[PDB]
Design a protein around this ligand. Structure first.
Ligand code: FAD
Ligand code: FAD
Ligand code: SF4
Ligand code: SF4
Ligand code: SF4
Ligand code: SF4
Ligand code: SF4
Ligand code: SF4
Ligand code: SF4
Ligand code: SF4
Ligand code: SF4
Ligand code: SF4
Ligand code: SF4
Ligand code: SF4
Ligand code: FE
Lengths: 652, 652
């Protein structure tokens, strides 16, 4: 049968129509071979727009549909479901991107944008003619979830999925769950003890009947697709018998190697054999082989003889249906902003280091003290937006929680020592959520915390006393201030965690300009990724506070529970297949596939290649490399792409 | 059985110990009758502290445990689980608050604070002796959910629950779903049309096999408890047969009565027979009997003969297990800030009215025009924080979205008319989330939008031209500005919706100081309420944007899916019960219960009262009002409270 194409040009209100002359593109589409219906509408994805396509498919007997509008990455599934409801196979639908790829980037070149939209429509129509009906492949869903990261976001996802009755696996990189929330003393805007409220959730997730906790473990490999993921978890060796470990801590006293305690942000010193924090879950000790000298002094003191250097990491193979990435964030390193002197001046600290100094279980015993002489500071300055809203460090985003934690920690210091003078150097006070503006009012009115509108130019240390001078313009007075302080606290921003690169490659997910993980859509899908079966939750998706991370943890559980609850999902049949009559078994395709899908086999007395359909992810590398043309990727066949290329210059 | 009490005095590091002499309180606890074990520890909620109680329950055969520490509102579940793990019934545990109620508020009166701690311990020990072992009530869960409000948040909850396989009911007050998002033209920070994200979701929810949509309907009654709610939905009469209606709108072109369109904020004119907006769902019409003259002109053009003036509202009785409140918000009415002249000056508009003016399907055809002469403004001023961060109007909170929508609408006006001059009068620019700070940078750098740091004192109209003058101090220059504008846009804040009072009474939920709905906990249960089985999602819980409302919608689906998935939930046994041997059926208790749990019945030939256990919420009002003493609330019995009162002055 000959193609009967329906072309739809969206205006997207004025997003497309305001730059591209949609009525003119619609008239041009009609001049193309096989195009029998062409219409322009304000919103093609809206009810009237979708009903218009369906009605035309039936009335004009269309076997191809072209929608010139937004990106397929946003509404391709939406229009595929729309055409399928009218009886048209979803793979006979073609998208032409004239918004993100045209109207939004050629706003001052309307005529050339209109001509580009015509060519993009002709290219879409050209490929559409040779598109073929493909059967959406129905695949089963393994009734099991995987959560990567055991912070407040990850713990919430696992608890929600576990409570729903779904088997869940929670992998935590460090020896304990809890994340950065465990490092905080209190939490704004209620000033609740962070661990005193998080600990119950850590306890709950550790003994949940539907949650398998793998602490001090890392996901080293993920293979497959939605509902059929095959994951490899490396249970790292603590070199201490897990079951015989009491958690008393007497073998550390003899260890001669001092390692900076990561949990205390480098202020504290721990041994090669240790426990992250006193309320850690699971409560067990670990040996760090990156700094261990293997002298065996700890083993002599240890009664249980739990210490075993011959311990080997275990690779656990698990099958899951959905994966939730909740690996969190890291604090920005302010060494780069040299004018502030971090790493040079002893009394210049970050806010996360202050959290630890303020924390009762911290290295200073909950006492805020100068690192140069151990004395309590009488005057403190907070410097906002350090590593945020700054093009010089490549971080042009708002870290979201720094205004609030600076005001919170200032209240905690005033509670401990009311005589302390505290000044906050800011640009904008961002107290945007429930009880936040009130917290800001309270900080000034009740605690006497002072606010200076002006981003400091530099910090100068007095080498004789260790005191610091903050140079900044009080923009509200139009005068330069040069106030002296005993301690300067840099309100550092949030950056993706160090392991984010490793996790990105394993899950096959993208990043946003801020370097955090990319959600499928900022409003249509805040916790989904463009990779089916992979979701996000917490700070790893972008800078945010606890309730936002907790809500995202719950949102991810719901979204990841949909495929599990359904028990069946549909996958794109854009896979490679070999034409046995043309393949002479050259073997070029075999090594090109990273999944090992194409394999040489015997057929009709001779050798030929054959693709294991289930192992093909549909990249199109082996068909591109096939020298005989026997290998072809459905939906991206060479002939289809060839006509698309012709479509840019002429009607084919 | 004789009470064997274990008393534990927490130091909370120095939070309690630094004011209260804990060792002295422990010595005093030992002098009380039945106290077998008394110990003081740094952190009672920590692993060593919890294990110390468990070990003592076993080794000293305790049948009562008293913990003198912080608030039960913080660690009551924690210590309940701790004692239950040692075999002790959780209702034989008593909490004494010596931190929030003593050490933290009597810091300068240590001696009196220690004597207060001793009395609080004696009061706890006194009640503890008469505490009894109790068991939780297990109840079934109806496999069905109810969502109130069909905005982006409510639609997301219903779609997620439906996709999970749970039957869901979505009740929408107005004739169409979509909410305030439907009124917006574009949406920050992507500047997508609001329709781009919302319409497909509206279409999906309207034809979902697991979602029953009741548009133009309201919940009039809710009875029961978690997993056993009995709801009454009033399907308001549209006076049109929905199944016969096509939604063509031939009727609207004939109707002679003009009613102000509520959807366009009074700026638009609709007919008696109307459709809220062109992309409305369901695509059906509605007759407003408040303004219909019943001429029957619309019925003559209606082909399928759907119009029926004899339509009566239907009361639908439905049984649900969980309820999600997503009723949204209303825009603040700026008439009260009289210095700005809203409702007095024709060219002073709200931001929500501007959304309708800018919208292509709006009353002005997407043209921003002055309401005094219909001309397009060349100079526009945006006034931030109108009805927010203001004690004079009783709204001391940040409305969260006004900074971003002002910058977004300014970008949109610049796109339609680049010659337009736009100034934004602000205090703090709150662009706190992903891509928000970048959107703010873009507004100034790309669109040339100007920012004036200064909250305007007043707006003065020129009665002769209709132009407005904005009086404000440019705080960054220390000079007073008196710039003239063609249009002044008030960036109005968010307030709870008008129906919020009705919904609050029906669901039995609380409100936070901002008047929005109260979540169970700000940090860990952001979408739950203290009322089991009732959840929140969207702007009705607090001012927030679409990404946050969508994530909350998904978070609520997950949380509301837990009881449904479990199929069984537990209810607290701290309920009222009647002692049949003492009750002579006086009937005083019956009308005191707002849930109607206590009921009169015939037993052994005589009248006696009986409480329906599942219906009791545990307030203790009817036992307090019982004149015979037959009615008692377990855990708060009169004898228990009597001993507690004695405990303040003496032992026992
Ligand atoms: C100084 C400061 C003060 C703050 N104060 C407050 C406050 O008062 N109130 C508030 O609400 N918020 C505050 N915040 C924000 C708060 O820290 C975050 O909201 C919160 O930690 C988010 O939790 P998360 O689970 O998403 O990530 P995280 O807390 O960082 O946890 C991530 C977890 O994943 C693990 N992980 C990382 N990589 C891997 C991997 N490859 N495999 C397995 N596991 C991995 C980590 O070890 C960690 O346990 C503050 C932030 C800072 C920096
Ligand atoms: C001028 C303006 C511009 C904005 N611009 C943006 C933007 O660009 N980007 C962005 O992200 N956010 C923006 N916002 C915020 C955005 O409007 C909200 O985030 C969003 O509408 C919240 O969705 P919701 O469902 O929670 O509330 P709503 O949109 O208000 O939905 C509530 C729904 O419940 C229904 N309802 C009410 N009462 C009852 C009842 N008793 N029974 C049944 N149903 C009921 C209502 O009719 C309504 O349909 C803007 C807000 C304003 C005022
Ligand atoms: S390794 Fe031995 S000494 Fe160290 S905590 Fe474990 S049991 Fe105690
Ligand atoms: S063997 Fe390793 S952990 Fe043990 S004492 Fe020596 S360096 Fe420390
Ligand atoms: S939240 Fe406050 S301190 Fe943090 S980057 Fe944004 S404006 Fe700066
Ligand atoms: S590359 Fe082409 S010809 Fe060679 S073995 Fe593979 S399918 Fe056959
Ligand atoms: S197209 Fe070829 S190389 Fe790519 S995943 Fe499929 S079989 Fe492997
Ligand atoms: S039990 Fe309460 S008072 Fe004692 S350490 Fe814990 S939080 Fe602080
Ligand atoms: S989202 Fe796509 S189809 Fe919908 S109105 Fe915007 S451009 Fe058109
Ligand atoms: S009531 Fe009749 S005329 Fe009006 S839209 Fe419905 S079908 Fe058309
Ligand atoms: S009968 Fe009512 S709805 Fe119909 S045209 Fe007359 S006023 Fe309008
Ligand atoms: S978001 Fe902006 S305009 Fe709105 S109340 Fe907060 S600071 Fe004021
Ligand atoms: S008030 Fe007391 S005595 Fe009277 S009916 Fe109720 S339980 Fe019986
Ligand atoms: S104690 Fe309160 S809720 Fe319970 S039966 Fe009596 S009045 Fe009703
Ligand atoms: Fe505690």
């Amino acid at each position: 049968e000959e193609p009967r194409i329906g072309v739809y040009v969206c205006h997207c209100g004025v997003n497309i129509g305001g730059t591209v002359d949609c009525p003119d593109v619609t008239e041009f589409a009609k001049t193309l071979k096989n195009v029998v219906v062409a219409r322009d509408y304000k919103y093609m994805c809206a009810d009237p727009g979708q009903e218009m396509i369906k009605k035309d498919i039936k009335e004009h007997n269309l076997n191809r549909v072209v929608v010139a509008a937004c990106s397929p990455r946003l509404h391709e599934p939406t229009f595929r479901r729309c055409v399928a409801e009218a009886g048209l196979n979803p793979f006979l639908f073609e998208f032409a991107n004239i918004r993100e790829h045209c109207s939004w980037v050629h706003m001052h070149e309307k005529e050339k944008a209109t001509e580009k939209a015509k060519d993009l429509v002709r290219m879409a129509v050209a490929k559409a003619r040779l598109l073929e009906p493909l059967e959406f492949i129905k695949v089963g869903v393994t009734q099991r979830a995987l959560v990567i990261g055991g912070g407040v976001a990850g713990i919430q996802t696992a608890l929600d999925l576990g409570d729903m009755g779904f088997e869940t696996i929670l992998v935590e990189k460090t020896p304990s769950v809890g994340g950065r929330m465990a490092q905080l003393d209190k939490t704004f805007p209620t000033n609740d003890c962070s661990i005193c409220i998080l600990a119950p959730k850590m306890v709950d997730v550790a003994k949940h009947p539907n949650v398998k906790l793998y602490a001090y473990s890392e996901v080293v490999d993920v293979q497959g697709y939605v509902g059929n993921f095959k994951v490899k978890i490396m249970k790292k060796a603590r070199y201490i018998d897990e079951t015989k470990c009491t958690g008393c801590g007497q073998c550390s006293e003899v260890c001669p190697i001092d390692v900076p305690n990561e949990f205390d942000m480098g202020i504290g010193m721990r041994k090669a054999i240790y426990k992250p924090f006193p309320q850690a879950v699971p409560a067990k000790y670990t040996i760090d082989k990156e700094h261990c000298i293997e002298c065996g002094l700890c083993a002599k003191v240890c009664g249980p003889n739990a210490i075993d250097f011959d311990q080997e990491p275990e690779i656990i193979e698990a099958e899951v249906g959905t994966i939730i990435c909740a690996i969190g964030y890291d604090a920005f390193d302010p060494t780069v902003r040299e004018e502030y002197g971090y790493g040079v001046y002893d009394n210049v600290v970050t806010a996360l280091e202050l959290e630890r100094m303020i924390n009762a279980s911290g290295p200073t015993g909950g006492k805020v003290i100068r690192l140069s002489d151990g004395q309590k500071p009488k005057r403190i300055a907070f410097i906002q937006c350090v590593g945020s809203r700054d093009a010089k460090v490549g971080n042009k985003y708002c870290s979201n929680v720094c205004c609030m934690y600076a005001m919170k920690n200032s209240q905690l210091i005033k509670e401990k020592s009311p005589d302390t003078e505290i000044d906050i150097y800011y640009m904008d006070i961002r107290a945007f959520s429930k009880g936040y503006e009130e917290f800001y009012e309270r900080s000034a009115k009740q605690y006497g915390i002072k606010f200076m509108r002006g981003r400091p130019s530099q910090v100068i240390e007095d080498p004789e006393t260790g005191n610091l001078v903050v140079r900044a313009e009080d923009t509200l007075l139009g005068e330069i201030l040069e106030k002296e302080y005993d301690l300067v606290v840099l309100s550092v921003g949030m950056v993706p965690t160090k392991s984010a690169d490793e996790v990105q490659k394993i899950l096959g997910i993208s990043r946003t300009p801020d370097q955090f993980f990319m959600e499928a859509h900022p409003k249509l899908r805040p916790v989904d990724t463009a990779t089916d079966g992979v979701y996000l939750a917490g700070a790893c998706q972008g800078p945010k506070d606890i309730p936002a991370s907790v809500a995202q943890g719950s949102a991810a559980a719901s979204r990841a529970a949909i495929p599990l609850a359904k028990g069946e999902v549909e996958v794109e049949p854009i896979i490679a297949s070999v034409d046995a009559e043309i393949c002479g078994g050259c073997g070029v395709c075999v090594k090109q596939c990273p999944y090992g899908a194409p394999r040489l086999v015997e057929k009709d007395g001779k050798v030929v290649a054959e693709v294991i359909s289930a192992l093909c992810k549909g990249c199109g590398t082996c068909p591109a490399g096939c020298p005989s043309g026997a290998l072809e990727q459905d939906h991206f066949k060479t002939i289809q792409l060839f006509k698309q290329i012709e479509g840019m210059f002429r009607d084919t």
